[PDB]
């Protein structure tokens, strides 16, 4: 029954970067990166921060919520990854990422 991050669109004014989790467990926040290397760039964090550009379709403060879809210039282009983190200490841990979405 392993959790999956369903990034439905291979490719996508306010763009919408769609994410859906199949499970709540293991518990932990949903984060977005542009790209994936040691240089990847954070775009949203459910756990902490202020992201005036980014906005969420569903109330991520509800325990049972599985919709992690966000409503976010040519500088914006790139591959986006919805990453599910599992709780850790000192830091959370990449659990599963969706396959990626190319913003054009």
């Amino acid at each position: 029954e392993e959790l999956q991050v369903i990034q439905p669109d291979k490719s996508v004014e306010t763009a919408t970067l769609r994410c859906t989790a199949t499970s709540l467990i293991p518990v932990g926040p949903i984060q977005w990166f542009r790209g994936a290397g040691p240089g990847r760039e954070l775009i949203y964090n459910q756990k902490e921060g202020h992201f005036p550009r980014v906005t969420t379709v569903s109330d991520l403060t509800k325990r049972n919520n599985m919709d992690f879809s966000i409503r976010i210039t040519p500088a914006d282009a790139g591959t986006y990854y919805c990453v599910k983190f599992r709780k850790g200490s000192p830091d959370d841990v990449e659990f599963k990422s969706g396959a990626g979405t190319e913003l054009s």
Partner: antibody
Framework: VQLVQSGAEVKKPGASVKVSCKASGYTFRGYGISWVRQAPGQGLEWMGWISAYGGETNYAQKLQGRVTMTTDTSTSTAYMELRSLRSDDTAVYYC?????????????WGRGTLVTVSS | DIQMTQSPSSVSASVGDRVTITCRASQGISSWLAWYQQKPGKAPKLLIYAASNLQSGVPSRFSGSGSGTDFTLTISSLQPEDFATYYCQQGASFPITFGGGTKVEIKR
């Protein structure tokens, strides 16, 4: 859906205690476990947290060095050891499922274990 | 360490009153604040999480508000079962911290 804790302990100062907590009725590894204690007539004091998935821990500063939390995934059991026991460790010790998505909270609680530390 | 401060420490009220209890965080914890109720001889119980979400089964008598540092738990139309101690708890970061507790007792 429950957490069932071991029985009351009576320890001498300088001794060690280990409290167990068996989970049933849910996927144990999905969640964290925290320990919270309450000395007689007092409030709640958080001791620490452990990931039941990967065993990462975080302990309250005050207890770092004397406390150890572990899990046994094979039996869905959480364990808390506390070492070099003093009088002021006397308290009821609770196990709680930590179940917040991207916050921490404790939605399922054990019934508590009394640990009495004295000469 | 984020210090949680609960006010008042005791509230006295009659069946039917509205009661309001407050918690102040020493710094911003977004809306990651939970409230518990404890009765004598019993483990605490989770009532409200993320400042204002009720846990399933908790009566609508209870509700919660706030963001950043200041938060409130309200109990509308108190019933004999609501007389207890209530704890807040910050859930933004380790170490997890609880407030000192607010006891709600019966005015007579």
């Amino acid at each position: 859906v429950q957490l069932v804790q071991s029985g009351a302990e009576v320890k001498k100062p300088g001794a060690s205690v280990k409290v167990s907590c068996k989970a049933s009725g849910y996927t144990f590894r999905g969640y964290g476990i925290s320990w919270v204690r309450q000395a007689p007539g007092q409030g709640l004091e958080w001791m620490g947290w452990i990931s039941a998935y990967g065993g990462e821990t975080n302990y309250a500063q005050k207890l770092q060095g004397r406390v150890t939390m572990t899990t046994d995934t094979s039996t869905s059991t959480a364990y808390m050891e506390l070492r070099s026991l003093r009088s002021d460790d006397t308290a009821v010790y609770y196990c709680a499922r930590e179940a917040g998505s991207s916050w921490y909270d404790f939605d399922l609680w054990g019934r508590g274990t009394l640990v009495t530390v004295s000469s | 360490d984020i210090q949680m401060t609960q006010s008042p420490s005791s509230v006295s009220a009659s069946v039917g009153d509205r009661v309001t209890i407050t918690c102040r965080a020493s710094q911003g914890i977004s809306s990651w604040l939970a409230w518990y109720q404890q009765k004598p001889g019993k483990a605490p119980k989770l009532l409200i999480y993320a400042a204002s979400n009720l846990q399933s089964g908790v009566p609508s008598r209870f509700s919660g508000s706030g963001s950043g540092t200041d938060f409130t738990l309200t109990i509308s139309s108190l019933q004999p079962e609501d007389f207890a101690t209530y704890y807040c708890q910050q859930g933004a970061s380790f170490p997890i911290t609880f407030g000192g507790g607010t006891k709600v007792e019966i005015k007579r």
